[PDB]
Each structure stands twice: as C-alpha cells, then as structure tokens.
Design a protein around this ligand. Structure first.
Ligand SMILES: Cc1cc2c(C(N)=O)cccc2n1-c1nc2c(c(NCc3ccccc3)n1)COCC2
Ligand SMILES: Cc1cc2c(C(N)=O)cccc2n1-c1nc2c(c(NCc3ccccc3)n1)COCC2
Ligand SMILES: Cc1cc2c(C(N)=O)cccc2n1-c1nc2c(c(NCc3ccccc3)n1)COCC2
Lengths: 161, 161, 161
C-alpha cells in the first residue's frame, strides 16, 4: 500500500478468484460486483475485458439524495415539524454520506442528553440540528476529488498498462 | 515487476519447464507457443538458441483485419444493410482489437435498450454505431508503440546479455 | 526546465512585464495574448485574477479544420481534380497541424521530382498523396494528450497554489 512493493500488487488469493470467475458460463444469472476506493493500485488482471468490463463511478450525493438520507436515518425518531428537511440539504453541499449521518447522530446525541437533564417535551427542535451544523467536518479533502473525477473520463487508457 | 528485484526474474517453475522442454526428441510433432506483452523482463534462459529460437512480432491490425473483426463479432445479430462495414474500418486506424470489440459492444448495448424502450423494428441502424464512434478510447498509448517496434528489428542483441 | 530549480521559475524579465501590464487603464483597447505549450511550470503570478483571467484550451483540429488546412496550404499549386480533399481528412484523425502540413510538403516534394525526371503533365495526382499517406508520423504522443485535457476542466484549483 501507499508506496507499494517493487512489483505488482498481485496475490495467490486474487489469481485464484479471477480464474474461478472465468469458468462459469455466460447464461448463469450470478452477478459479481466489486467495490474499491483507490482504483489505481488494483491489478488490471481482474480489469481484463471479460471479467470487469463496465466501470461505474459513484459521485458525491446531490440535493435529491442529501434530503433522502436525512429522511431515512431518523425514520424511528419523533422529530418535530418545526425543522425543515430541504433546508439542511440546502446548506450541505460538500459533505459525504458519513458526514450527513454523523450530523444527525450528533443532533440526536445532544437532544437525548437534555431530555434526561430536564428530569431533575421529548422531541428534536431546530436548535438541536443547529448545534450539529457548526461542528460539521469534511470526510474527504479537495485534492482527492479531482483525482477521482480525472479517472472517470479517461479510464480505458489504464487497461493493459 | 515494474522495478523488479535485485537479480534476475527467474523461478523454480520456469527452470523446471525449460529443462523439461529440452528432453523431447526433435522428431516429435509437439509444438509449444509462448505469448507475452512486455518482452524485456523475461529471462533469456528460455530464449536460448534451441528452446525459443524464432521471435515473431504481432503488429496493430490493418484494414483487412479491422473489417474482418467487425464482420465476426456480430455474426449472430440482425444488423441492417444500411450500415457499411468498410466505412468503420476507414475511420478506425489507431485502435486495437479490444477497442474494435468494445465499440460493437457499446453499439449493441445502446440498441438493445431502445428496443425495449419502444415497447412502452429490432435492428441496428447507422446512428447506433455513430454513438459508439464518439465514445471510443485508445487501449494502448503511443510511447509504448515505438517501444514495441524498436525491439522488432534489433532483438538478437538481447540474447546472452 | 524539465526538473526545474529548487524554487519557482520566476525572473526579473517576468516580474517587470507583469507589473507593466497592470499600470494601464481598463478603458484602453490594447489586448495582450499569451501562448504556451506546457502550462504547469509558469508562475501563477501572471495567472493572477486581473492579468490572465480567462484560460482557453486549443484542442486537436477536427474534420472541418483538417479539410480547410489542406485547401489552404496548396492554394498556389495546380492540384488536379482527381484527388479528394475530404477523403484525406477522413483517414487523418489523430494528426496535428504540423503533420497535416508535412504530408502535403512530402507529396509536393515527390511530385516535383518526377516532374523534372520526366524531362529526360505537371500536376499532382492521387498516388502523389498516397505515398505521403504511408510515411505519416505523429507529432504528439498519447500520454501528453490526456495530460492536456486534464488541465482543461480542473484549472482554477492551480490558482494560488
Ligand atoms: C444509515 C445509512 C448510513 C449511510 C452511510 C454512512 N456513511 O454511514 C452512507 C450512505 C448511506 C447510509 N445510510 C442509508 N441507509 C439506508 C438508506 C439510505 N438512503 C439512500 C441512500 C443510500 C446510499 C447512498 C445514497 C442514498 N441511507 C435507504 O433506506 C435503507 C437504508
Ligand atoms: C471476440 C474476438 C475478440 C477479440 C479480441 C479482443 N481484444 O477481445 C482481440 C482479437 C480478436 C478477437 N476476437 C475474434 N475472434 C474470432 C475471430 C476474430 N477475427 C480475426 C482476427 C483475430 C485476431 C486478430 C486479428 C484478426 N476475432 C475469427 O473468428 C473466430 C473468432
Ligand atoms: C502553413 C500553415 C502551417 C500551419 C501549422 C504548422 N504546424 O506548421 C499549424 C497550424 C496552421 C498552419 N498553417 C495555416 N496557415 C494559414 C491558415 C491555415 N488554416 C486554418 C487554421 C490555422 C490554424 C489552426 C487551424 C486552422 N493554416 C489559414 O489561412 C492563412 C494562413
């Protein structure tokens, strides 16, 4: 990793699976899907035209997905109607799914503390999301982004070399 | 690979096969054929004069082969006569067999989608190949080419050293 | 160049011109245009927002320009009508202006020799371009191309750093 060895990053566990996936007939309905995060160090051996032909890029979530993740990760919480779901996605532009989830995690974590502290009503208010807004961080940097969408348009050139 | 180790790229699986292929008599009709893509890192031990004597170079496909690959990879498809087989090879000059195949793959893939979409006639038209023409890429670069045909004329010098 | 020095590639002839071009008022009609071929080693000092704001990329010539260059570089030659201007641009896809010009230069050079040799009629025939077709070379490689169109979409990131 990172620097790497003197040769290719091949393995006796990679060759045996890439050979196994070639014995199957084309008419079987089995579908294998691979996932990675650093597509520059994987061997082109599995990227050969006939094992991994189609390459699909997953970009950053857009507005329609950002609003959906928030309506999904709190489906079992009594969130009040005072908050606005689209508004959060309106500020959130350069955040990934981990950031969008951890914002809601922080908001729920602070709300659940004041809920118990008031015992010495149990609903999430707008300020609860507001505190989580300011403590937001960026899971990914900027330089790696353009690295990712420079492999998207020019990727067939890496096959074979 | 790539950089390589401190010594030669020899192996106990290479020496045992190069020794095995020397025990056979010359009058047997068994013929062994090797194939590689980076003929600068293989040991000259198997390239000795008496195991791998003749060296044969495979250049890029020419016009006559480019037209043939297209007439071969779609032999089981109802392609209409509106398209021209020679015309595609006329534009395609600096593409390899993988590119020539993936062009037809893309054209068939887009045609098969509109065929189903029209259900809400099943033949490949000229525009179907036209879209695949623009999304063409180059499997190989340019610098590696002259690398390949500089080993073709001067190769006996690498034997023994 | 190439490797470069330990610091920036600044000069007392670059600073004095970039300072001089800032003294002029915006209402003057003087327009300065710069041209380069390796836009990764020039200082961002002249690329500051207010001296060189707009960045314009010159891609490879397309079909409409390839046919035009041929109709332009032989405007003073008695070329016969047997040849086809669009046909040459139909084969020529991955060639730059220097290659397109040198093809015509070679064709004219071989025609002018047989014109004198026949003295022991003076028009360019199809075979004259045909010989020049086979001796064609590529002025630019492939790896530098994707290098050029990877700076085109992501260029504002290089400003300031
Ligand atoms: C708990 C949860 C965590 C999480 C994370 C994460 N970094 O933890 C990343 C992506 C989705 C995630 N989800 C998630 N989980 C689900 C859904 C959903 N929304 C749609 C979606 C998913 C991925 C992409 C776009 C949009 N998101 C949809 O309902 C079922 C489960
Ligand atoms: C599906 C197919 C894929 C493919 C590929 C590839 N990169 O996937 C490369 C070369 C030939 C290929 N073929 C192919 N397959 C066949 C033929 C044929 N044409 C003649 C030829 C072959 C190699 C060379 C020149 C010309 N081409 C001939 O009929 C039988 C099978
Ligand atoms: C002799 C000549 C050489 C040359 C070269 C070269 N590497 O020597 C490169 C580009 C244009 C060139 N020309 C050239 N010269 C001219 C024209 C023209 N065609 C239009 C054009 C120009 C640049 C770009 C696209 C298309 N091309 C147009 O008429 C006047 C002079």
């Amino acid at each position: 990793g990172n620097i790497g060895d003197g040769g290719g990053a091949a393995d006796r566990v990679i060759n045996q699976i890439l050979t196994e996936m070639d014995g199957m007939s084309t008419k079987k309905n089995v579908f294998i899907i691979g996932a990675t995060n650093r597509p520059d160090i994987i061997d082109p051996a599995i990227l050969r035209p006939g094992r991994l032909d189609q390459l699909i890029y997953i970009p950053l979530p857009d507005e329609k997905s950002r609003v959906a993740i928030l309506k999904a990760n709190l489906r079992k919480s009594p969130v009040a109607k005072d908050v606005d779901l689209e508004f959060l996605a309106k500020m959130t532009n350069g955040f990934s799914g981990a950031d969008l989830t951890e914002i809601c995690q922080r908001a729920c974590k602070l709300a659940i503390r004041e809920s118990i502290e008031s015992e010495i009503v149990p609903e999430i208010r707008r300020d609860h999301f507001e505190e989580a807004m300011r403590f937001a961080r960026r899971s990914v940097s900027d330089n790696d982004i353009r690295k990712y969408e420079m492999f998207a348009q020019t990727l067939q050139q890496s096959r074979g070399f």
